[PDB]
Design a protein around this ligand. Structure first.
Ligand SMILES: CCCCCCCCCCCCCCCCCC(=O)OC[C@H](COP(=O)([O-])OCC[N+](C)(C)C)OC(=O)CCCCCCCCCCCCCCCCC
Ligand SMILES: CCCCCCCCCCCCCCCCCC(=O)OC[C@H](COP(=O)([O-])OCC[N+](C)(C)C)OC(=O)CCCCCCCCCCCCCCCCC
Ligand SMILES: CCCCCCCCCCCCCCCCCC(=O)OC[C@H](COP(=O)(O)OCCN)OC(=O)CCCCCCCCCCCCCCCCC
Ligand SMILES: NC(=O)C1=CN([C@@H]2O[C@H](COP(=O)(O)OP(=O)(O)OC[C@H]3O[C@@H](n4cnc5c(N)ncnc54)[C@H](OP(=O)(O)O)[C@@H]3O)[C@@H](O)[C@H]2O)C=CC1
Ligand code: SF4
Ligand code: SF4
Lengths: 113, 198, 43, 317, 157, 385, 339, 178
């Protein structure tokens, strides 16, 4: 609840700002004032058309590395595990196998944008 | 009075003869100014051949194109006088090869010989209207996208025929025939007295 | 007579060459500092 | 009383946000041989309030081609998450003490990447997509090392609660140990706030960026958000790695030193901005995936090993 | 004092002060006059001191300092950028090339003034209008912005 | 592919460039720069203006190197008149010519950084630039656009305090280059942004007519100041800073060296400037002195005719090239016997350089193009003319 | 007088010095445009701050447009404005009775004082503009009051032309934008389900050109022209057509006017510019009168321009990205009603 | 004489010491820290800016600034309408038409400098035989309306009367040079 109280004030403060921002100011709007904007000449394209991302393989990896992190996140509680040996043996294997994933990402054109 | 060394007027003169001899099929006149500058003059057909010999000859390497321009002598049947100024970093000398082109008799393009000319040739078409065959992409460079007329021609009015203003009714910039609020005062400046025999 | 001219004997000399100073701690010594922090910090 | 406290955390922070802008426009100035803004008000103190009023009054422009929600949600989200992340910071005592506090800060930061994505799609203007897609990528990439760097920290703190570090750092800053990551936390803090060395999100020379089609108020809110973040992330550096001295008898010397260290590290990213040219888009990702991620993942393992064989496993709780 | 008139005079004085103190000019410089302002942005005559901070995105700009000749090929653009600037907006024409055609007045490719293309608020004269001279012109815009009384006109309208 | 104007109003173009790109995502496949946004008709207007009243136009073609530009017209017109400037004037033109190359290079190096994102170098040097304009203003009355270098000689003698003040500026300027030297020459971030970007091979540079720091950066050894010594560049000693490889870094490093070498040339000019007259003594070419025109009839007639009608240079044509800070700036002035020129083709170091952008920016990102334009030092006044 | 010299475009002279008191208006903007294009001397009395009249500066040439500070209540301001004008054009009008100005003032009271002074001055001709179908008994106070004026001004200024335009069609107009802006409203009320209120729009320019031509023609004296349009329309097609070009759903639902006059009363309370007006509402459902009268357009020299032709430009801003590229051809036309 | 910039004279073979020094340069961003030191240094330098209204950037006597028409001490305007100021103006700015005044003297009925057309070359200052048209020191004459910038004889003569004291001092300082 205490958090709920804080957060709703947080949204309220932001919604308050945006609202004022739209109603207080006066507005007059010929087109060409609202038209899309590309440096002063007509766009010359849809501005939403297919845009290539040279980072094809980097992107896929991030997601995989994120997940590993996930698996790396429980560690703080797992440190206190009585086993210890297995903990580290496990954690070291996870970090090493993902890093090798990275390694192959580098070796392959991935991560080379 | 400027200092003049005749070493150059002799060196350049000789080269002129050398070029002429090597390219007699096109060289019409080859002169050296009193300012120690050579100016081989070639038939328009010799554009490709004369340049290439100068770009690739051991005794005359003229690697870079300083400029391509076209004076317009309206009196001259062939209106334009395409002038190509070249530099030889090897022999530290410049030469100018100038040809003649009329409005509708195009000249060859030298983009092959020097790619520097890709832009200047577009500049000559836009301003003077000479056309260059075999040009990769000839299209107006300096003038407005819809400009009608070639501006540096001596027969084109300075102020031109169209000017632009924003019209509210149509909410867009709009050409209108030029209306000037103080016409260019055309001072006559030539004096009725000559200076020397020249 | 009086025109703006170089002072008699000429002006002094002006430096034009780069005077960037190669001032820094030697690399080995540098490593030790950070390493020492970690070594101690861990203890 | 709780509200009083809510007000005490948000209002001051927001005011601090404002004056950071002024301070950014004077410290950059003196570094560049210029006074900076001193003519409006005394010594420029009224300068931040002045453009705030100019920004809100100028007409908010809704591009002909623009969503009207993914356009107004984006700033609101940016200010809401940034001001929200100050809720758990343990300046001395935190306000809302959360047992999994650092996961709250990491998660809330992650959500801000959307605002960039939503604003870019909303604007549907080139110079915007080209700014949002690259931007989301930068922010996300600098999240993967950002998170791993924290996991290394936590394992030496014992818990996710930011309050524990005040007890972990009662004898020495976590910079001495783990300095190699501080640097890597600092550079990642520079990327995630799209500040200079990594300001490609919105490069000006490159795509003038995500904010081109945004004006007036819509513009200010992110704006405010960025600067508040600029502080928050610096403040997290000043709790996690530079641990201010804590005395249980007088709590404010903790906040006094928190004040001093936060201002200096906030001053540092101002100083970084003026001092360095901006990195290339791929040069930026080349750093994180090639230069930093292998360093972080390996040093992550060293921080699971340092505890065990040095019999130093941290006390939970 | 107590009068709905006094409250409406004081509050615009507030609104005018905010616009006056923070004028964000647009990063739009043509020809050379742009240099004579890059000198205003520079340390001898800082402009930021006065509030102004260059911001490229027309969308986030208050003043358009047209510097240099407005050719007939850049005209169609200037109008676009002026049209896309946020409403409260002002134009300062710098240079005899822009306020009037200057050298190049009679050219076929030069618009004889930006006043033909965009309404102009202050005209700063001089071939390279000096940088103080631009700073005087920007300060004259601030005097014009102080005098404006938009709220008063709405009240007695 | 996608097309972005990357055009006018950008903070990367000078304000007047339309660079239609064919970006495939971030990589840039093709560029088709659309210049013409600042074509003023400079060369059709000159035909209608007398030789002195066209000088001013030459200060506005490259607006960051005013006097070196007006030293190319002054040398041309002087050639066509077979007249030479007096000895003091030639040193003054070399003194002002190197102050302009320091002024252009401070412009080119600092604005390039402004584009890349380094803000501070611009502010530190721009204060050093107003120190320099002051020298223009104190000698001509205009901070920039002086009109000081006249077709025959220069217009007025240096005030009596200028050479001391130029020494004090030159004495302390090198530390100022040293300071941006430290802040933007080894930053891994600069090197990465500049090194191995826009490499141009030696023969390709000559073929594309680059003729400038772009020519020297790839190792070709060509300076019109030593090869074809114009004015007094035969009596001053300097080292051309030839770069080795051609990346935008080697070209930056060359521009920083030329600023240093120009301080060496400025030093020599202050140390060895001759006592004498600043304009040739032929009243037919250079106007008569104020006292003389007000006391001698031959001088009033010569003042009246020169200002109203003109020099009437003898019929001929010349291409005179001087090493302007950007590169070879040349005027092909064709002259009928009339007092007003017939044609004046301004060769702009820049029309050739911008053509090279498509070839130089090959296999490069949107961001690299911002560096590619920056390293050509292109001012659209010279290109558009 | 001023002999007309020039080729016809800006920087030329036509010899019409004309005070135009309400130039800042939608119609006005256009009136100054042609007058400025022609080269006429235009004096624009203004009350709004200079910022708002900047849009008029680029129109007209240097020293051709002069702006004077003027207050309707203060008789002296009108006096000096017409001091040196020979043509006075009155476009003073509003839809919302403002706190300090009543329909009488904006239509009858003020426009009288103005022409009154104009005579004292000796202006050759005065053009007064009043809304079309304006009976002294018409329902809308506005229309009736306007009628009251056209009478009075004739006694202050005899043989004063009185053009009487229909609701105007143009970018920045209300007739077309108002309906298109009903989008915000989920449902678009239409009295009698938008029937029996046939309406004939007229392009703004046509009106402007017409007005200007009046200034430069001896044939118009005491004439009460009526610029009408090129085609009439039942309000139904108009509304839908608009929504058609705007590409926004059309949901015609009838609303009893008695209740709707009340809705107008509601918005009418807006402290700031009122969206709609009780007096508006009536006007909107006030049927366009038939065309038997001193003809306007064509008669004065301009051929009317069909609505569909330029509608695309007026309604474009209201479309969404999805339809922005869409063109007139794709859309359908509305149907006229000679009735 | 040439000079190689960025040319490595030789291949220094890596020595551990060298390698460490380098590796440290990459790992601990040593050169980046060097750059920060430079900016911190200036932060401590005195800023070079001037209060613009209160202090003014220095302009010496030849500054061209704003046009003015001078008058003789007696009060007779200097211009005698020779009209070569019109002839040498590069921009066509000055328009002069003249007629013999009643006194019988030569004077200009209309002298109009279009300042928007003028590019402040300063040749008119040069050309005038009586030196009636001078480049006055003032540079601050920015105007709200375009028409104000066009200047007739009365504005320039008035400009001349206002700034005559400084114009006389400026011409006094620079005439020996001319
Ligand atoms: C409970 C589930 C979550 C509810 C909130 C999010 C979804 C809201 C309902 C969305 C329904 C689809 C829709 O509205 O599409 C039209 C919208 C229309 O776009 P718009 O409304 O965002 O803006 C465009 C406005 N016009 C059309 C005038 C240009 O398309 C979308 O953008 C879909 C995503 C946003 C939809 C609205 C989200 C509101 C979230 C409030 C918190
Ligand atoms: C008082 C203000 C002090 C400001 C210090 C920086 C500006 C002055 C720099 C002067 C200079 O030029 O020397 C730089 C010098 C210049 O050296 P160099 O780059 O010329 O070469 C020397 C190094 N070798 C020879 C090996 C290549 O740089 C260094 O000495 C190394 C700096 C390493 C910095 C590592 C990252 C920062 C530290 C991170 C860990 C946390 C430290 C504490 C953080 C804050 C805690 C509260
Ligand atoms: C805007 C969108 C983002 C909103 C801000 C981000 C909020 C992120 C909240 C993350 C979870 C916080 C949390 O887990 O704290 C739980 C809190 C204490 O729980 P605990 O830590 O376990 O301590 C127990 C013993 N002391 O006690 C609780 O149980 C708190 C329960 C949740 C509180 C949420 C507060 C409101 C946030 C949602 C607002 C929804 C409206 C906006 C929707 C936006 C949609 C895009
Ligand atoms: N659809 C239409 O537009 C039609 C219009 N008409 C008539 O044509 C005329 C012009 O219409 P339109 O341009 O749309 O009207 P607007 O609402 O655009 O206003 C016209 C002008 O009148 C001025 N004005 C209004 N009230 C006052 C006042 N109390 N004191 C001084 N000035 C005032 C306004 O100046 P400011 O804004 O500065 O106060 C404005 O510039 C009107 O009078 C109207 O009766 C007739 C038929 C249809
Ligand atoms: S005005 Fe003078 S300076 Fe400004 S652009 Fe035109 S010419 Fe260059
Ligand atoms: S030159 Fe001097 S005197 Fe002769 S007209 Fe021009 S101003 Fe008058």
């Amino acid at each position: 609840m205490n958090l709920y109280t804080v957060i709703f004030i947080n949204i309220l403060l932001s919604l308050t700002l945006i609202l004022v921002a739209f109603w207080l100011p006066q507005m007059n709007l010929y087109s060409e004032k609202a038209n899309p904007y590309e440096c002063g000449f007509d766009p010359t394209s849809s501005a939403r058309l297919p845009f290539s991302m040279k980072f094809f393989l980097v992107a896929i990896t991030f997601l995989l590395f994120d997940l590993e992190i996930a698996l790396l996140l429980p560690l703080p509680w797992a440190i206190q595990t009585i086993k210890t040996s297995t903990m580290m043996i496990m954690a070291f294997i996870l970090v090493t196998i993902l890093s090798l994933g990275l390694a192959y990402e580098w070796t392959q054109k991935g991560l080379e944008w | 009075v400027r200092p003049r060394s005749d070493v150059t007027h002799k060196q350049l003169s000789a080269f002129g003869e050398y070029v002429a001899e090597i390219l007699p099929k096109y060289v019409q006149q080859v002169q050296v100014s009193c300012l120690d500058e050579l100016e081989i003059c070639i038939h328009p057909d010799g554009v490709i051949p004369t340049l290439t010999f100068l770009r690739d000859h051991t005794n005359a390497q003229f690697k870079s194109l300083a400029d391509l321009t076209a004076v317009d002598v309206p009196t001259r049947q062939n209106r334009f006088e395409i002038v190509y100024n070249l530099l030889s970093l090897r022999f530290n000398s410049r030469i100018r090869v100038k040809t003649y082109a009329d409005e509708l008799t195009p000249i060859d393009s030298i983009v092959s010989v020097h790619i520097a000319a890709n832009w200047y040739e577009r500049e000559v078409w836009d301003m003077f209207g000479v056309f260059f065959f075999n040009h990769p992409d000839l299209r107006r460079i300096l003038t407005d996208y819809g400009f009608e007329g070639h501006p540096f021609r001596k027969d084109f009015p300075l102020t031109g025929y169209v000017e632009l203003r924003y019209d509210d009714e149509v909410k867009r910039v709009v050409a209108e025939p030029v209306e000037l609020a103080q016409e260019f005062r055309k001072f006559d400046l030539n004096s009725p007295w000559e200076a020397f025999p020249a | 007579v009086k025109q703006d001219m170089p002072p008699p004997g000429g002006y002094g000399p002006i430096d034009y060459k780069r005077n960037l100073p190669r001032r820094g701690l030697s690399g080995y010594s540098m490593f030790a500092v950070g390493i020492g922090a970690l070594i101690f910090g861990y203890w | 009383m709780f509200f009083i406290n809510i007000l005490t955390l948000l209002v001051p922070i927001l005011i601090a946000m404002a004056f950071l802008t002024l301070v950014e426009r004077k410290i950059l100035g003196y570094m560049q041989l210029r006074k900076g803004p001193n003519i409006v008000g005394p010594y420029g103190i009224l300068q931040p309030f002045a453009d705030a009023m100019k920004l809100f009054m100028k007409e908010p422009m809704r591009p002909l081609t623009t969503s009207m929600s993914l356009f107004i949600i984006a700033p609101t989200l940016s200010l809401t998450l940034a001001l929200s992340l100050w809720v758990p910071l343990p300046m001395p005592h935190p306000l809302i003490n959360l047992n999994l506090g650092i996961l709250f800060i990491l998660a809330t930061s992650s959500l801000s990447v959307y605002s960039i994505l939503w604003s870019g799609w909303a604007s549907n203007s080139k110079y915007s997509l080209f700014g949002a897609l690259r931007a989301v990528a930068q922010t996300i990439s600098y999240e993967v090392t950002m998170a791993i760097i924290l996991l290394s920290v936590l394992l030496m703190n014992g818990s996710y609660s930011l309050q524990t570090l005040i007890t972990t750092q009662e004898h020495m800053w976590l910079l001495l140990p783990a300095w190699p990551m501080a640097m890597m936390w600092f550079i990642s803090t520079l990327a995630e706030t799209n500040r200079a060395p990594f300001d490609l999100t919105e490069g000006e020379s490159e795509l003038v960026g995500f904010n081109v089609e945004y004006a007036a108020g819509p513009f200010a809110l992110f704006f405010m958000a960025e600067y508040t973040n600029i502080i928050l992330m610096n403040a997290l550096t000043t709790i996690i790695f530079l641990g201010p001295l804590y005395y249980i008898n007088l709590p404010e010397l903790y906040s006094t030193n928190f004040m001093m260290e936060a201002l200096l590290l906030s001053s540092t990213f101002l100083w970084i901005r003026a001092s360095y040219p901006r990195f290339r888009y791929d040069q930026l990702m080349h750093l994180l995936w090639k230069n930093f991620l292998p360093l972080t993942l390996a040093l992550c393992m060293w921080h699971i090993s340092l505890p065990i064989f040095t019999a130093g496993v941290p006390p939970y709780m | 004092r107590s009068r709905a008139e006094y409250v409406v005079t004081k509050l615009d004085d507030l609104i005018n002060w905010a616009r006056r103190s923070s004028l964000w000019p647009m990063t739009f410089g043509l020809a050379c006059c742009a240099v004579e302002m890059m000198h205003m942005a520079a340390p001898r005559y800082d402009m930021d001191r006065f509030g102004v901070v260059f911001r490229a995105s027309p969308r986030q700009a208050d003043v358009m300092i047209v510097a240099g000749t407005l050719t007939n090929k850049m005209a169609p653009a200037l109008r676009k950028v002026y049209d896309q600037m946020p409403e409260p907006r002002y134009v300062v024409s710098m240079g005899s090339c822009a306020n009037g055609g200057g050298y190049y007045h009679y050219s076929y490719s030069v618009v004889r003034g930006c006043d033909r293309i965009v309404p102009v608020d202050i005209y700063v004269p001089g071939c390279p209008p000096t940088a103080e001279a631009l700073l005087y012109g920007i300060l004259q815009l601030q005097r014009k912005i102080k005098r404006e009384q938009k709220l008063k006109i709405w009240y007695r309208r | 592919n996608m097309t972005l104007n990357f055009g006018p109003q950008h903070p990367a173009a000078h304000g007047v460039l339309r660079l239609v790109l064919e970006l495939s995502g971030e990589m840039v496949r093709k560029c088709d720069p659309h210049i013409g946004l600042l074509h003023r008709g400079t060369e059709k207007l000159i035909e209608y203006k007398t030789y002195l009243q066209a000088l001013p136009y030459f200060d506005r073609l490259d607006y960051v190197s005013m006097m070196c530009n007006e030293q190319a017209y002054s040398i041309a017109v002087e050639k066509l008149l077979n007249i030479q400037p007096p000895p003091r004037a030639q040193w003054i033109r070399v003194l002002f010519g190197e102050i302009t190359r320091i002024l252009n290079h401070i412009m080119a190096v600092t604005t390039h950084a402004l584009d890349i994102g380094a803000m501070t170098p611009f502010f530190w040097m721009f204060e050093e630039r107003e120190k320099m304009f002051e020298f223009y203003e104190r000698v001509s009355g205009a901070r920039m656009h002086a009109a000081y270098i006249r077709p025959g000689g220069v217009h007025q003698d240096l005030p009596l305090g200028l050479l001391d003040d130029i020494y004090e500026f030159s004495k302390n300027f090198s530390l100022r280059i040293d300071e941006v030297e430290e802040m933007l020459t080894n930053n891994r971030i600069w090197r990465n942004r500049t090194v191995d970007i826009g490499v141009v091979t030696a023969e390709d540079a000559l073929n594309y007519g680059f003729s400038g720091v772009m020519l020297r950066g790839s190792g070709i050894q060509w300076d019109l100041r030593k090869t074809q010594p114009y004015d007094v560049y035969d009596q001053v000693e300097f080292d051309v800073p030839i770069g080795s490889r051609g990346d935008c870094y080697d070209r930056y490093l060359c521009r920083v060296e030329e600023m240093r070498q120009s301080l060496r040339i400025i030093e020599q000019c202050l140390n060895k400037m001759p006592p004498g007259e600043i304009k040739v003594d032929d009243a037919k070419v250079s106007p008569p002195k104020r006292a003389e025109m007000k006391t001698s009839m031959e001088s009033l007639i010569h003042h009246f005719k020169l200002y109203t009608e003109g020099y009437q240079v003898p019929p001929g044509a010349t291409y005179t090239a001087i090493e302007a800070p950007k590169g070879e700036f040349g005027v092909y002035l064709v002259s009928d016997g009339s007092s007003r020129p017939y044609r004046c083709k301004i060769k702009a170091p820049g029309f050739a350089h911008l053509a090279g952008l498509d070839k130089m920016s090959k296999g490069h990102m949107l961001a690299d193009v911002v560096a590619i334009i920056g390293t050509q030092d292109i001012v659209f006044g010279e290109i558009d003319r | 007088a001023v002999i007309p010299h020039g080729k016809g475009g800006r920087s030329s002279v036509s010899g019409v010095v004309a005070t135009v008191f309400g130039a800042t208006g939608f119609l006005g903007r256009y009136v100054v445009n042609h007058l400025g294009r022609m080269g006429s001397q235009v004096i624009i009395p203004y009350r709004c701050d200079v910022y708002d009249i900047m849009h008029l500066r680029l129109m007209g040439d240097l020293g051709q447009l002069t702006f004077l500070e003027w207050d309707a209540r203060d008789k002296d301001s009108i006096r000096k404005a017409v001091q040196h004008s020979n043509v006075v054009i009155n476009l003073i009008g509003r839809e919302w009775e403002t706190r300090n100005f009543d329909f009488e003032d904006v239509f009858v009271n003020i426009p009288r004082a103005i022409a009154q002074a104009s005579k004292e001055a000796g202006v050759e001709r005065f053009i007064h503009v009043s809304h079309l179908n304006a009976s002294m008994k018409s329902s809308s106070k506005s229309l009736r009051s306007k009628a009251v004026g056209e009478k009075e001004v004739r006694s202050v200024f005899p043989e004063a032309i009185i053009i009487r335009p229909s609701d105007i069609f143009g970018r920045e107009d209300r007739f077309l934008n108002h309906f298109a802006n009903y989008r915000w409203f989920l449902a678009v009320p239409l009295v009698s389900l938008g029937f029996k209120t046939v309406k004939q729009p007229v392009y703004v320019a046509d009106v402007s050109k017409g007005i200007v031509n009046a200034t430069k023609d001896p044939d118009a004296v005491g004439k009460t022209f009526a610029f009408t349009g090129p085609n009439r329309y039942l309000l139904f097609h108009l509304v839908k057509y608009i929504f058609g070009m705007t590409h926004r759903t059309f949901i015609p639902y009838p609303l009893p006017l008695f209740v709707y006059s009340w809705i107008g009363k509601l918005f009418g309370l807006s402290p700031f510019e009122p969206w709609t007006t009780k007096d508006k509402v009536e006007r909107i459902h006030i049927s366009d009168v038939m065309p038997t009268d001193l003809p306007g357009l064509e008669d004065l020299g301009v051929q009317p321009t069909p609505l569909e032709l330029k509608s695309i430009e007026v309604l474009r801003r209201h479309r969404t990205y999805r339809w922005l590229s869409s063109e007139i051809e794709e859309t359908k036309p509305a149907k006229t009603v000679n009735y | 004489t040439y000079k190689y910039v960025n040319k490595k004279e030789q291949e220094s073979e890596v020595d551990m010491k060298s390698a460490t020094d380098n590796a440290a340069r990459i790992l601990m961003w040593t050169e980046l820290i060097r750059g920060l030191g430079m900016t911190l240094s200036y932060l401590f330098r005195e800023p070079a800016t001037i209060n613009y209204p209160f202090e003014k950037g220095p302009l010496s006597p030849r500054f061209r600034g704003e046009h003015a028409l001078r008058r003789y001490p007696s009060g007779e305007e200097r211009c005698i309408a020779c009209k070569l100021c019109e002839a040498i103006c590069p921009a066509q700015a000055i328009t002069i038409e003249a007629e013999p005044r009643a006194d019988g003297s030569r004077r200009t009925t209309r002298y109009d400098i279009d300042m928007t057309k003028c590019i402040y070359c300063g040749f008119c200052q040069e050309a005038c035989p009586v030196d009636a048209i001078v480049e006055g020191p003032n540079f601050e004459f920015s105007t709200e309306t375009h028409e104000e910038l066009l200047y007739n004889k009365e504005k320039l003569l008035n400009n001349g009367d206002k700034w005559e004291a400084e114009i006389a001092a400026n011409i006094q300082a620079d005439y020996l040079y001319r």
